[PDB]
Amino acid sequence: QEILQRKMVREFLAEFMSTYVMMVFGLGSVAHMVLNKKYGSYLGVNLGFGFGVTMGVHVAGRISGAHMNAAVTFANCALGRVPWRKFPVYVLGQFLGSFLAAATIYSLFYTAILHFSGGQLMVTGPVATAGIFATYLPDHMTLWRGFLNEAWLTGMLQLCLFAITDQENNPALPGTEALVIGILVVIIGVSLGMNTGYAINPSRDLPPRIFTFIAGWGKQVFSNGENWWWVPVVAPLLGAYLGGIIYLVFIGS
Amino acid sequence: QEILQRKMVREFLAEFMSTYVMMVFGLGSVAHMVLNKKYGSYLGVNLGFGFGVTMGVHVAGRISGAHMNAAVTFANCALGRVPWRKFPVYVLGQFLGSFLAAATIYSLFYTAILHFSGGQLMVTGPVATAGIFATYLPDHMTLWRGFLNEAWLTGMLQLCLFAITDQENNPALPGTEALVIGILVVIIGVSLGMNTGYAINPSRDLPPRIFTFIAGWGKQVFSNGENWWWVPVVAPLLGAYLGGIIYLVFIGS
Amino acid sequence: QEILQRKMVREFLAEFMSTYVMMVFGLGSVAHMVLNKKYGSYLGVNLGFGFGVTMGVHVAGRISGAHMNAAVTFANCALGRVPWRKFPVYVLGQFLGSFLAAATIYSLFYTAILHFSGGQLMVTGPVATAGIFATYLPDHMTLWRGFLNEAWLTGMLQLCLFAITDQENNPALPGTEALVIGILVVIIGVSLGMNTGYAINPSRDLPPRIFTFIAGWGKQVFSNGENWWWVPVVAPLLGAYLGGIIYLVFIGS
Amino acid sequence: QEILQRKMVREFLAEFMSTYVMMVFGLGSVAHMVLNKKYGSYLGVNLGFGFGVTMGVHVAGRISGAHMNAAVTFANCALGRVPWRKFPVYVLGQFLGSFLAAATIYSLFYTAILHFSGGQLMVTGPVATAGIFATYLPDHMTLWRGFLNEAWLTGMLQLCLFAITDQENNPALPGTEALVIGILVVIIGVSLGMNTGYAINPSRDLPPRIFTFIAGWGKQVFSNGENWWWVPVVAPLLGAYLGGIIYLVFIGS
Amino acid sequence: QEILQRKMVREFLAEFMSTYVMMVFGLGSVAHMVLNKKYGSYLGVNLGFGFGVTMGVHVAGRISGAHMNAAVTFANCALGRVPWRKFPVYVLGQFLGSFLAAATIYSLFYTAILHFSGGQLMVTGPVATAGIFATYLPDHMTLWRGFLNEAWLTGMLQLCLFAITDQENNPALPGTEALVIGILVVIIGVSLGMNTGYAINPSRDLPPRIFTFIAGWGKQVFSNGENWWWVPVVAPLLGAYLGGIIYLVFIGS
Amino acid sequence: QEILQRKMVREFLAEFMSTYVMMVFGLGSVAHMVLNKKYGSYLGVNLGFGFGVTMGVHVAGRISGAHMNAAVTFANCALGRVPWRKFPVYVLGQFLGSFLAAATIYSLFYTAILHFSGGQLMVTGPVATAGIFATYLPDHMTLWRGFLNEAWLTGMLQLCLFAITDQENNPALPGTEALVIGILVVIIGVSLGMNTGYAINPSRDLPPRIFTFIAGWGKQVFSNGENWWWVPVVAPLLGAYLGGIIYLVFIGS
Amino acid sequence: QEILQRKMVREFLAEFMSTYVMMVFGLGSVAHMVLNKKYGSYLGVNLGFGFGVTMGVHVAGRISGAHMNAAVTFANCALGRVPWRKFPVYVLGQFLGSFLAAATIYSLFYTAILHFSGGQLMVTGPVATAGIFATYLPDHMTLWRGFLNEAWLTGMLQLCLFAITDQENNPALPGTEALVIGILVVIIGVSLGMNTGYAINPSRDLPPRIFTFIAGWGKQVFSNGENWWWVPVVAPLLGAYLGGIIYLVFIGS
Amino acid sequence: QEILQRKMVREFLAEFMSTYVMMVFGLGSVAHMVLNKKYGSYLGVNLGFGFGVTMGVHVAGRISGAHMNAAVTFANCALGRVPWRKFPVYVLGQFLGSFLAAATIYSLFYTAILHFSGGQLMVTGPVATAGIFATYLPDHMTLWRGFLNEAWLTGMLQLCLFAITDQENNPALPGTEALVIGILVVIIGVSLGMNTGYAINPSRDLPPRIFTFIAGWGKQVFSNGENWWWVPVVAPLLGAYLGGIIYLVFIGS
């Protein structure tokens, strides 16, 4: 038990658990929306994926701040708030948590997925089920506009997160920040979601895609949409950095 | 009035009242969803059954902690937080409250039930009404996968309820814990509900089934779904124990 | 301005304004649900009529407690919390506020009502519009069962209101009671609403009916449903008294 | 950086950013409702446009109070709370923020707008898209009744926003005012929205209309509905002034 | 084989076979309309029950004229066209054919009926299946108005049958009368069908009702609708007699 | 019985009966389409109103030719085929038959009309029932365009009826002309019907309107649609005359 | 060209062409019903099959009688009407015609099939397309009941075909038999079709199944439904023989 | 009037009138299907466009045979049945008739077209109206497959027309050929219509396209779908020639 005494292990485990819980809730809501129409709705996805973040923040608040997203960690490290030493640990914890959450969601809804798909797993089609785990580019939307959407959404998320938590300007009452963050995520999903699925998280996107690829959806997951997989990994970092810079320069003294 | 002075009677009455109120709200929402399509929706069931737990916590907060679920009481007693002496009292109070709540819900919606069913009470069918009181296994889902779903959902519920209330790590602001618990139950219902009805409560499941059996739905309530009735009584205990152990070992110092 | 200095006038004006605001919001939500199907839903009615109570409590909190319901005032006066001297003043304020709110709602949605009804105002029918202002008994539901439903709902409301506000047992955090009361009203509407429209308020029911009768819907508003109008005036008083007695005897020490 | 030290520049930038964020969220929700029916609903618009005001208040709370609406600023200046010197600065900041938010929303949803409209931009019609940015008068509703609706809604908004914030009577708990304000806006949209789109904000209305006019929707945006554009600029000022006067005279000592 | 040489036996067998075929087609169309909505429509029932008469006329044209209806036989016998000696033979043949056709239709659609009803056979209800074999009075329609409808429809049918076949006035081209009669029945069903199911045939109505009663639908088939069963047995006789009298007196020289 | 010997009385009775039967079938189909959506469709109206003409032609073929339409009689008289002496007799017979058919249709569907309308008879509205008997101008269509539509449709009907019956060019096989005429009316209704209801018959239009006016629909039947009632009385005469002239000049030698 | 002079070659070619045309029309109607919901309906399939049989009868009437079905040929040969020498020639012609018709239908609707199925050909599933060519047993219906349905339908078809064509009893007018046969097939499809797809033709069933098997739907076409493929090959022969025997013994002298 | 005596003028006028009537009926049915969904269906289009051909055949039967299609005329002239001298006259008559029919249909449905399109005429889009007059290639279907479909459909039409009319083999009863031809066209539309709109007529396709181009739909009518306009002008000629050759060689002695 001597390993668990170190603070690095604690900051790894807290991130792992919080990301796992949030991803489980989000993927469950998405599966409900996709598979069964009677029990699913877009507002259900928004509520689940917004108030799962709240539970993750509650779980891993003091230990590591509950980043739960690699773009937020990159933005914090670039601004000097968090040293670069802890970046790989947070990234590994988030990736492992998301991968295990995707595995759990696949395990729970196995029979429903088989019944809906008819036994054949298709990435794209009328009965496609690969969109539950990772986001895919719609038909009308293009690649670079998707890049713009991802970067812009991540920028707004980072600016709002800076505004809510900042103690100098107008912080939320302590102990109620999780509800405000959850409502922020909910309204982000409601208002700016249909264009690209509002990924704005490399941890939410890549590990589920890898899990589907090794589970059996095939190599079409990467090559679909003119190699769309790398956009959610690149755009959010720049978006979050720009949003933090804008907030700090303008409103943050 | 000398009987009411004893603390055991108080801890019995508080549990009885809180469980009664929560079960009344939940069963009313379920009946609204089942009977009338215009006035019912899945989100309505989630909201009612999540924010009735908030009222129950408010009613029976200080006296006994408002366990309102036999799985939570078993998990607390196994970890030494609550002595084993008070377990039967809590179980009896919860069972009586749930039974009376089911009776009240049956009394209120009698004419609507008769009109919808046409006068014949059927456990399974196009106009089945036995699913209002207790959960039943869907067609595609099997028994052991239902056991897994129940155990996993109860484990997640226990882990989240332990994280929210824990004073050392990151407790919610006192006086606002009921809202957070209600939102947790709402998102659990939204995200992980369609597989088995998210029973995760022996008190919510068994007494309504017994009430239907003695009211006249017949003995088909127990034998349906390869004797499904015992799964919600066994799985949540193990799920809650495992969730509490995991949280205590990893995150709770 | 010497009249406004007296406390009686202030406690009358506060009740008038709070009841007016709450009734305006509730009737607007009901009109949205009834007239236009695209912009209306049952959940919209529940949210509007639940969180209008919150705004009324905020407006008239300290001056008079924001009873906004004759049943609550009668229950408080019968238990000795409020002297009988202030009962007529509160009743008159609530009645005037509700009547003016009904008049305002009629004034705002005049063209939409005329377009939907085709120019003819009918109490009952496929294009009936008299149900916006007052509740009417459904076809399957009978008179005495409606009396039972009204009394039971008012009793549950009074018990929950006692539980939430009581300082000794487990009060909500001060400054956040309005949100909890609004959520309570929302879940009451969601869970126990389709049977009779969850009137549980003489002030919400009678003055709008009188306004419709003098506006031109005819005398059919009173005689419809075997003289249903007197049930919402009688049942809630007994329901609230019984709920308060039960809470005080069992849980409130 | 010497310019940013002055308080006037700070009060300009805070208003600009808060109005920009709120308008972005509101227009995104409206576009979701209009373009795609599966991902859009009226409740989504209400939630987005209500809880965007919460984030705006959080962003620009201490610096300038987050007026975010010219009617509120005019009402405050007329009552002497805010000097007339700061009115033009606030108005310019709000106008610029709203114009840039409309431009951003147009940039993000360009392909979806082209696909839905078929390539032709029409102010009025079965595939009209000019209603995303600015509100337009419905067919049954007339001009002066729209004026009445706008003034009345702004009056109720001002009275409630004067109640939730007043420290003497019954203020909300500090740090939680943003949630209550957001819920107020949500219920306003739910209850009193279908008549005219509940503009009640010159900044929310005029700059998007100007942006559409210069973007290419034509000059039909102004002349439509018997020159409806000037009503949202005139009615809210009188409505807010009357609401503030009523609250101050009656309930505010 | 000496029995089959007699003309009475031949005129009995022809009626039996023709009535059997027509009833089989009609009941099959009705079952398609009732059970499966995708494969059923009112126009399908009209076409089947109209062009089954054509096939029956083709089968039993020369031997006995293909009366296939006790009302037509009674009308012909009362006018002296057919002697009273052959009335019981025709009635017995029609009754036996209709009973066997109902038995065959019950045998073919057994599994579909069990699946649709859930295993319980109900005369009236949301999943009622007793209406496939015999007609039942709707909720809004009364007994004596049903008598009037039946008599009037039978009178119109008899007048049109007299007009089509009459050689003196304007007979249809020989060999094509069956198509015209089928189209007449189709348009009768289309134009005057929703009030009472356009029974206008004792042979089409009573034997299926008796078959359901002995098969297990219970004694509710006779007592339903204020003893509706005797109206289709009495009204068509008077209707057909009056129609024939009117045609002969006015148009038929 | 000496009166019935005269040929004038015979032709009068034949026209009366044929028009009565055709109008009964057409109005029954229209009532089915209007009142009940499950049992009604536009194709049902077309088939009923097309193959009722066939039955009328069969009934009154040799005696008078079964004009059943004042426009056809006027066109025949203007061309010298029929002397002007018999025009008033035919017109009176058609008018009386149509009036009695409207009365019969009103008598049969009385309860259904009362249930659908809620007890109030409205010429125009969401539950209007005056359109069953007579045609009314739609909202988008204007008066003179309706005149053009009526005249053009009557012209095409006259040209086709002249071509079908003409013995010199290419007559249909005798005894099958009724089916061809019915199919012609059906396709006219299918192809050119939604603009004005394809009245093209003064006898089909005016007497039902008069019957509704005296039955209680009020004087709004005449004044509706800028006095639309006179167009179906004037346009078909000119249309039929022009069609007959065109056919005779160009194709009929 | 000396080969074409022989009567055997002519009786082969006529059967080939008629079966080809009828199968093409039927499969086109089925594909329209299955693929596109807007352009497809069950009544369309019924009309296509019936009036394609009509066209086949017109094409191959005098040369060979247009059997177009192996059951009819077997029934005729067993009764001595057709010698056994011509049975193999007719069977081969029908099989070749049906196979080529299936190939043509596959060639025409290739892109639509690929678009609907998403590129994957599945025998059973939500996007199954193997049912266009051959009939498959529904879920509720069993094997032996399907055998009974097929035999009974073929018996009724044979009895009606004997009745229509028989010159002694009541033949249809020569030159109009094709319309009557088409209407018979249409009403058979309307009344007795949903149970098993009313195959009642080995030539209509087996060759399309073989074509799908060699085209790429796999070997699941034969093994599906407990080896359902042999029922349409065996049942119709017995059904047709029994129907012919019954008609000849009872009605056919 | 000396011009009308010549047989060439008669063969021009008969073709003109018959084509005009058939095109009017077909375009009216198509407009009903496209504009109003309540009054339009695919089966309506099939019935109208099939039984308009019947009326055209009746009108112009003896004078010129009622070719009404340039493909049929070319096929007849190539086989020597009709001399090449009369080909240009028939083509000109058909073209003029179709152009005037398109003009008439545009004149009748002007207000409905403007209301549906919103005032803007678009060839392709959600509110496109250019498809009423001429057929356009669907999205999934390609150019050469459309050529194949057109040629194949015209071939089947020509083969069936040869079979129906041929006196030696099995002609339809004289005077009833029009009904059989109409049913043939109806089933062609039902079975093989959704791929390309079953143009199979240059006269039905090109003149309406030219009329739309000069009326104001723009030059996009020709360039749409990779210059689709020339396929309906080329494919039907080859299809009809091949069908006639096949019928003459194989079945026609």
PDB file of N, CA and C in Angstrom, chain A residues 30-78:
ATOM      1  N   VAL A  30     -25.828   8.572 -24.929  1.00  0.00           N
ATOM      2  CA  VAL A  30     -25.753   8.503 -26.388  1.00  0.00           C
ATOM      3  C   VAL A  30     -26.357   7.200 -26.900  1.00  0.00           C
ATOM      4  N   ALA A  31     -26.062   6.083 -26.228  1.00  0.00           N
ATOM      5  CA  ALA A  31     -26.626   4.801 -26.635  1.00  0.00           C
ATOM      6  C   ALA A  31     -28.143   4.799 -26.501  1.00  0.00           C
ATOM      7  N   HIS A  32     -28.664   5.389 -25.421  1.00  0.00           N
ATOM      8  CA  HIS A  32     -30.112   5.511 -25.281  1.00  0.00           C
ATOM      9  C   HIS A  32     -30.714   6.299 -26.435  1.00  0.00           C
ATOM     10  N   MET A  33     -30.080   7.409 -26.816  1.00  0.00           N
ATOM     11  CA  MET A  33     -30.609   8.202 -27.923  1.00  0.00           C
ATOM     12  C   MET A  33     -30.573   7.424 -29.233  1.00  0.00           C
ATOM     13  N   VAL A  34     -29.488   6.692 -29.480  1.00  0.00           N
ATOM     14  CA  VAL A  34     -29.294   6.065 -30.785  1.00  0.00           C
ATOM     15  C   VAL A  34     -30.175   4.831 -30.942  1.00  0.00           C
ATOM     16  N   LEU A  35     -30.167   3.935 -29.952  1.00  0.00           N
ATOM     17  CA  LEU A  35     -30.798   2.631 -30.137  1.00  0.00           C
ATOM     18  C   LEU A  35     -32.320   2.728 -30.086  1.00  0.00           C
ATOM     19  N   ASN A  36     -32.867   3.156 -28.953  1.00  0.00           N
ATOM     20  CA  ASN A  36     -34.309   3.177 -28.742  1.00  0.00           C
ATOM     21  C   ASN A  36     -34.815   4.609 -28.856  1.00  0.00           C
ATOM     22  N   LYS A  37     -35.769   4.831 -29.762  1.00  0.00           N
ATOM     23  CA  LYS A  37     -36.302   6.172 -29.970  1.00  0.00           C
ATOM     24  C   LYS A  37     -37.275   6.585 -28.874  1.00  0.00           C
ATOM     25  N   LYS A  38     -38.027   5.635 -28.314  1.00  0.00           N
ATOM     26  CA  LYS A  38     -38.981   5.969 -27.261  1.00  0.00           C
ATOM     27  C   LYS A  38     -38.275   6.466 -26.005  1.00  0.00           C
ATOM     28  N   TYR A  39     -37.144   5.858 -25.655  1.00  0.00           N
ATOM     29  CA  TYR A  39     -36.432   6.169 -24.424  1.00  0.00           C
ATOM     30  C   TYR A  39     -35.262   7.122 -24.633  1.00  0.00           C
ATOM     31  N   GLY A  40     -35.117   7.694 -25.821  1.00  0.00           N
ATOM     32  CA  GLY A  40     -33.971   8.525 -26.122  1.00  0.00           C
ATOM     33  C   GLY A  40     -34.367   9.846 -26.745  1.00  0.00           C
ATOM     34  N   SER A  41     -33.560  10.864 -26.459  1.00  0.00           N
ATOM     35  CA  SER A  41     -33.751  12.192 -27.024  1.00  0.00           C
ATOM     36  C   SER A  41     -32.435  12.951 -26.936  1.00  0.00           C
ATOM     37  N   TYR A  42     -32.329  14.007 -27.746  1.00  0.00           N
ATOM     38  CA  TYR A  42     -31.128  14.835 -27.733  1.00  0.00           C
ATOM     39  C   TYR A  42     -30.952  15.528 -26.388  1.00  0.00           C
ATOM     40  N   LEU A  43     -32.052  16.012 -25.805  1.00  0.00           N
ATOM     41  CA  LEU A  43     -31.979  16.639 -24.491  1.00  0.00           C
ATOM     42  C   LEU A  43     -31.489  15.659 -23.435  1.00  0.00           C
ATOM     43  N   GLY A  44     -31.838  14.378 -23.567  1.00  0.00           N
ATOM     44  CA  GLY A  44     -31.303  13.384 -22.654  1.00  0.00           C
ATOM     45  C   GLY A  44     -29.794  13.268 -22.746  1.00  0.00           C
ATOM     46  N   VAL A  45     -29.262  13.273 -23.972  1.00  0.00           N
ATOM     47  CA  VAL A  45     -27.814  13.242 -24.157  1.00  0.00           C
ATOM     48  C   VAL A  45     -27.173  14.468 -23.529  1.00  0.00           C
ATOM     49  N   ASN A  46     -27.758  15.646 -23.763  1.00  0.00           N
ATOM     50  CA  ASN A  46     -27.196  16.869 -23.201  1.00  0.00           C
ATOM     51  C   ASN A  46     -27.177  16.816 -21.679  1.00  0.00           C
ATOM     52  N   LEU A  47     -28.298  16.423 -21.067  1.00  0.00           N
ATOM     53  CA  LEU A  47     -28.363  16.365 -19.610  1.00  0.00           C
ATOM     54  C   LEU A  47     -27.374  15.355 -19.046  1.00  0.00           C
ATOM     55  N   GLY A  48     -27.311  14.159 -19.636  1.00  0.00           N
ATOM     56  CA  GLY A  48     -26.391  13.152 -19.132  1.00  0.00           C
ATOM     57  C   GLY A  48     -24.942  13.583 -19.239  1.00  0.00           C
ATOM     58  N   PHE A  49     -24.539  14.058 -20.420  1.00  0.00           N
ATOM     59  CA  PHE A  49     -23.150  14.442 -20.627  1.00  0.00           C
ATOM     60  C   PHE A  49     -22.791  15.736 -19.913  1.00  0.00           C
ATOM     61  N   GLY A  50     -23.777  16.519 -19.483  1.00  0.00           N
ATOM     62  CA  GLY A  50     -23.490  17.719 -18.731  1.00  0.00           C
ATOM     63  C   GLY A  50     -23.383  17.466 -17.245  1.00  0.00           C
ATOM     64  N   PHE A  51     -24.304  16.680 -16.691  1.00  0.00           N
ATOM     65  CA  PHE A  51     -24.305  16.408 -15.261  1.00  0.00           C
ATOM     66  C   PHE A  51     -23.486  15.178 -14.890  1.00  0.00           C
ATOM     67  N   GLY A  52     -22.839  14.529 -15.857  1.00  0.00           N
ATOM     68  CA  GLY A  52     -21.817  13.561 -15.520  1.00  0.00           C
ATOM     69  C   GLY A  52     -20.520  14.263 -15.179  1.00  0.00           C
ATOM     70  N   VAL A  53     -20.264  15.374 -15.875  1.00  0.00           N
ATOM     71  CA  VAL A  53     -19.118  16.221 -15.552  1.00  0.00           C
ATOM     72  C   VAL A  53     -19.213  16.716 -14.115  1.00  0.00           C
ATOM     73  N   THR A  54     -20.426  17.048 -13.668  1.00  0.00           N
ATOM     74  CA  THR A  54     -20.622  17.483 -12.287  1.00  0.00           C
ATOM     75  C   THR A  54     -20.207  16.396 -11.303  1.00  0.00           C
ATOM     76  N   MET A  55     -20.625  15.155 -11.559  1.00  0.00           N
ATOM     77  CA  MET A  55     -20.259  14.054 -10.674  1.00  0.00           C
ATOM     78  C   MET A  55     -18.758  13.807 -10.696  1.00  0.00           C
ATOM     79  N   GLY A  56     -18.137  13.913 -11.871  1.00  0.00           N
ATOM     80  CA  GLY A  56     -16.692  13.762 -11.944  1.00  0.00           C
ATOM     81  C   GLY A  56     -15.952  14.834 -11.165  1.00  0.00           C
ATOM     82  N   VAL A  57     -16.422  16.081 -11.257  1.00  0.00           N
ATOM     83  CA  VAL A  57     -15.825  17.169 -10.488  1.00  0.00           C
ATOM     84  C   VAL A  57     -15.978  16.909  -8.997  1.00  0.00           C
ATOM     85  N   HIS A  58     -17.150  16.425  -8.581  1.00  0.00           N
ATOM     86  CA  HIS A  58     -17.351  16.093  -7.173  1.00  0.00           C
ATOM     87  C   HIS A  58     -16.403  14.989  -6.725  1.00  0.00           C
ATOM     88  N   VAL A  59     -16.199  13.978  -7.571  1.00  0.00           N
ATOM     89  CA  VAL A  59     -15.368  12.840  -7.193  1.00  0.00           C
ATOM     90  C   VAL A  59     -13.902  13.249  -7.080  1.00  0.00           C
ATOM     91  N   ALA A  60     -13.387  13.969  -8.075  1.00  0.00           N
ATOM     92  CA  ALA A  60     -11.959  14.257  -8.165  1.00  0.00           C
ATOM     93  C   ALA A  60     -11.673  15.752  -8.085  1.00  0.00           C
ATOM     94  N   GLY A  61     -12.333  16.446  -7.164  1.00  0.00           N
ATOM     95  CA  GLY A  61     -12.176  17.883  -7.056  1.00  0.00           C
ATOM     96  C   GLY A  61     -10.877  18.344  -6.424  1.00  0.00           C
ATOM     97  N   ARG A  62     -10.641  17.946  -5.175  1.00  0.00           N
ATOM     98  CA  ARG A  62      -9.488  18.453  -4.437  1.00  0.00           C
ATOM     99  C   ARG A  62      -8.178  17.806  -4.872  1.00  0.00           C
ATOM    100  N   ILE A  63      -8.200  16.520  -5.230  1.00  0.00           N
ATOM    101  CA  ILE A  63      -6.954  15.789  -5.463  1.00  0.00           C
ATOM    102  C   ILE A  63      -6.202  16.368  -6.656  1.00  0.00           C
ATOM    103  N   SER A  64      -6.898  16.574  -7.774  1.00  0.00           N
ATOM    104  CA  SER A  64      -6.236  17.024  -8.990  1.00  0.00           C
ATOM    105  C   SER A  64      -6.977  18.124  -9.735  1.00  0.00           C
ATOM    106  N   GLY A  65      -8.136  18.570  -9.255  1.00  0.00           N
ATOM    107  CA  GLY A  65      -8.910  19.577  -9.945  1.00  0.00           C
ATOM    108  C   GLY A  65      -9.907  19.039 -10.948  1.00  0.00           C
ATOM    109  N   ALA A  66      -9.872  17.737 -11.236  1.00  0.00           N
ATOM    110  CA  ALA A  66     -10.805  17.089 -12.157  1.00  0.00           C
ATOM    111  C   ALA A  66     -10.778  17.757 -13.531  1.00  0.00           C
ATOM    112  N   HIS A  67      -9.606  17.706 -14.166  1.00  0.00           N
ATOM    113  CA  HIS A  67      -9.489  18.222 -15.525  1.00  0.00           C
ATOM    114  C   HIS A  67     -10.354  17.417 -16.486  1.00  0.00           C
ATOM    115  N   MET A  68     -10.201  16.093 -16.478  1.00  0.00           N
ATOM    116  CA  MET A  68     -11.022  15.157 -17.241  1.00  0.00           C
ATOM    117  C   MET A  68     -10.991  15.423 -18.742  1.00  0.00           C
ATOM    118  N   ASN A  69     -10.084  16.278 -19.208  1.00  0.00           N
ATOM    119  CA  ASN A  69      -9.997  16.644 -20.615  1.00  0.00           C
ATOM    120  C   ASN A  69      -8.569  17.080 -20.895  1.00  0.00           C
ATOM    121  N   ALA A  70      -7.985  16.563 -21.977  1.00  0.00           N
ATOM    122  CA  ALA A  70      -6.591  16.862 -22.277  1.00  0.00           C
ATOM    123  C   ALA A  70      -6.388  18.285 -22.778  1.00  0.00           C
ATOM    124  N   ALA A  71      -7.417  18.897 -23.368  1.00  0.00           N
ATOM    125  CA  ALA A  71      -7.294  20.280 -23.809  1.00  0.00           C
ATOM    126  C   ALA A  71      -7.232  21.241 -22.632  1.00  0.00           C
ATOM    127  N   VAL A  72      -8.022  20.990 -21.586  1.00  0.00           N
ATOM    128  CA  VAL A  72      -7.965  21.824 -20.392  1.00  0.00           C
ATOM    129  C   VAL A  72      -6.604  21.697 -19.721  1.00  0.00           C
ATOM    130  N   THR A  73      -6.079  20.472 -19.637  1.00  0.00           N
ATOM    131  CA  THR A  73      -4.761  20.270 -19.047  1.00  0.00           C
ATOM    132  C   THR A  73      -3.680  20.974 -19.858  1.00  0.00           C
ATOM    133  N   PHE A  74      -3.753  20.884 -21.189  1.00  0.00           N
ATOM    134  CA  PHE A  74      -2.774  21.573 -22.024  1.00  0.00           C
ATOM    135  C   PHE A  74      -2.860  23.084 -21.847  1.00  0.00           C
ATOM    136  N   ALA A  75      -4.079  23.626 -21.792  1.00  0.00           N
ATOM    137  CA  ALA A  75      -4.241  25.063 -21.599  1.00  0.00           C
ATOM    138  C   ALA A  75      -3.688  25.507 -20.252  1.00  0.00           C
ATOM    139  N   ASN A  76      -3.942  24.727 -19.198  1.00  0.00           N
ATOM    140  CA  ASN A  76      -3.429  25.082 -17.879  1.00  0.00           C
ATOM    141  C   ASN A  76      -1.908  24.999 -17.832  1.00  0.00           C
ATOM    142  N   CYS A  77      -1.326  23.976 -18.465  1.00  0.00           N
ATOM    143  CA  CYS A  77       0.125  23.831 -18.447  1.00  0.00           C
ATOM    144  C   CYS A  77       0.804  24.927 -19.260  1.00  0.00           C
ATOM    145  N   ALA A  78       0.200  25.326 -20.382  1.00  0.00           N
ATOM    146  CA  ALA A  78       0.803  26.363 -21.213  1.00  0.00           C
ATOM    147  C   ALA A  78       0.812  27.716 -20.515  1.00  0.00           C
TER     148      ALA A  78
END
